[PDB]
Structures are given as structure tokens and as C-alpha cells.
Design a protein around this ligand. Structure first.
Ligand SMILES: [Zn+2]
Length: 251
């Protein structure tokens, strides 16, 4: 009747995150994950994905963290990606062709790593929701016949096409922080329901802690997210609300 997609971002970031996502899926409500095809532990993530058919995998398009697959002289500094892209976007100085080519390269490498088309595309730091990147990424997803994470409030603030590609009816980025709880997760569900949404994607970041995660400002809350997502109470509350646990393939 309703479909709930619970998507863990940043598959491939680190081995500890990889094991947190697998655990949140095998013993929790995580149904989906999106992978950094350039991540330090991407080959490790791909071995787990191949062994865990019950986990759907999409592509975490990334323009701000690793090294790109293709040469992007209009974007990289000392060969690396980084967070200057926000200012570069507002100065209308994005190398949009380089970006489109890197999107195609990350897609090609995704299929090599995992042996299937990604169920959908989202992005590290939500860069695919930038006004000038969104129509490129959505046209790509439409072209490939796959879905897109669509933050509908961001799209509406930026005049973007809500139908640019197939997606869930709504998306929530509100399940995060130090105060993560079962309550918080369920509040995003009940808020989606009141908006009249028949499907919802809920972002999350479960992980076991390793030295890579310890280098992030968001570290130990990932353990709390893992705890919430694997509690027996949560599956009951999801079912209680008429949700079927699902993936972007259902859209
Ligand atoms: Zn991310």
C-alpha cells in the first residue's frame, strides 16, 4: 500500500561503514544503499554487495571527496575533488561537460564493480540537486531507465522539474544527528503520510567505527543509527503504518 525505501549513503567509504550497512540490512530495515565508486573501500563494498542479494545498490555520484575517475581540470585541485563546488556553482563556473562525462564514467565503473545497473542515482553532499547539475543527472537516469533521489523541497525552491526522473513520492534527510532515535525515524514517516505520500526514501548513515569514520565530524552517531535501524520495535512500527519495505526498483 505504501513503500518505504531506507537508503544508507556512502557504501564504499570505509570497511566499517560497509559492515554497518550490511548489518542494518540483514538484521534491520535498510533496504538500499548508494555507493561511492571511487571510495577507499569500494572493492570491499562490491564483494559484500555480490554476497547480499537482499540489499539493493544505487550510485552515490560524488564530486567533492575522492579523486575523480576521469580528468576534470575544470574542477579538481591538486588532482582531488573538494567542497569549493558550492561557490563554483553560485559563480556559474561549473565545468558542466566535465561533470557530465564524470557521471558517465562513475556509472560505467558502478556496473563493473557490482554487475548490475544501479537502481537509482543520488549524490554525496546532495550535489546532484544543484540547479545546473540536476537536469543533467536526471536526463541521465531517465536515459538509463533508473530512478533518482529527488529532494522535492529543494527542487521546488529552485524551479526544478519534479518529474525529471522516476523517484519516490518524497525524500527525508531528517534522520541524522546526535539525538537519533526511533521517535525521530517515525516522525519522518508520519510527516510523509500526512503529506499524502505513497512512497518515501529515508536517508541514513549506519556504520561501525574505524579510523576513517573517526576522521569525520559525524562519527559516533552512526552507531546510534545502526542501533535504531536494527531494533525489532522499528520493523513493527513500519509494518504498523502500512509500509512495505522496498527499493527504488518498486518505483
Ligand atoms: Zn553522502
Amino acid at each position: 500500500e505504501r513503500v518505504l525505501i531506507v537508503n544508507a549513503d556512502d557504501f564504499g567509504l570505509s570497511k566499517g561503514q560497509n559492515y554497518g550497512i550490511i548489518e542494518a540490512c540483514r538484521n534491520g530495515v535498510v533496504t538500499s544503499t548508494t555507493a561511492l565508486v571511487n571510495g577507499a573501500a569500494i572493492d570491499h563494498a562490491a564483494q559484500l554487495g555480490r554476497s547480499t542479494p537482499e540489499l539493493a545498490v544505487g550510485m552515490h555520484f560524488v564530486l567533492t571527496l575522492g579523486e575523480p575517475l576521469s580528468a576534470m581540470p575544470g574542477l579538481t585541485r591538486d588532482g582531488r575533488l573538494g567542497k569549493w563546488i558550492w561557490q563554483q556553482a553560485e559563480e556559474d563556473s561549473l565545468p558542466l561537460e566535465e561533470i557530465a562525462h564524470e557521471l558517465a564514467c562513475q556509472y560505467h565503473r558502478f556496473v563493473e564493480l557490482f554487475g548490475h545497473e544501479p537502481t537509482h542515482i543520488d549524490s554525496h553532499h546532495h550535489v546532484h540537486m544543484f540547479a545546473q547539475i540536476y537536469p543533467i543527472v536526471a536526463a541521465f537516469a531517465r536515459e538509463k531507465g533508473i530512478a533518482l533521489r529527488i529532494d522535492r523541497q529543494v527542487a521546488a525552491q529552485s524551479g526544478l522539474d519534479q518529474q525529471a526522473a522516476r523517484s519516490s513520492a518524497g525524500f527525508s534527510s531528517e534522520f541524522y544527528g546526535e539525538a537519533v532515535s526511533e521517535e525521530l525515524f517515525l516522525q519522518t514517516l508520519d510527516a510523509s503520510i500526512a503529506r499524502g505520500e505513497r512512497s518515501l526514501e529515508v536517508m541514513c548513515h549506519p556504520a561501525y567505527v574505524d579510523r576513517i569514520i573517526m576522521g569525520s565530524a559525524y562519527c559516533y552517531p552512526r552507531l546510534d543509527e545502526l542501533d535504531v535501524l536494527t531494533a525489532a520495535s522499528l520493523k513493527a512500527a513500519v509494518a504498523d503504518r502500512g509500509y512495505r519495505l522496498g527499493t527504488y526498483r518498486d518505483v
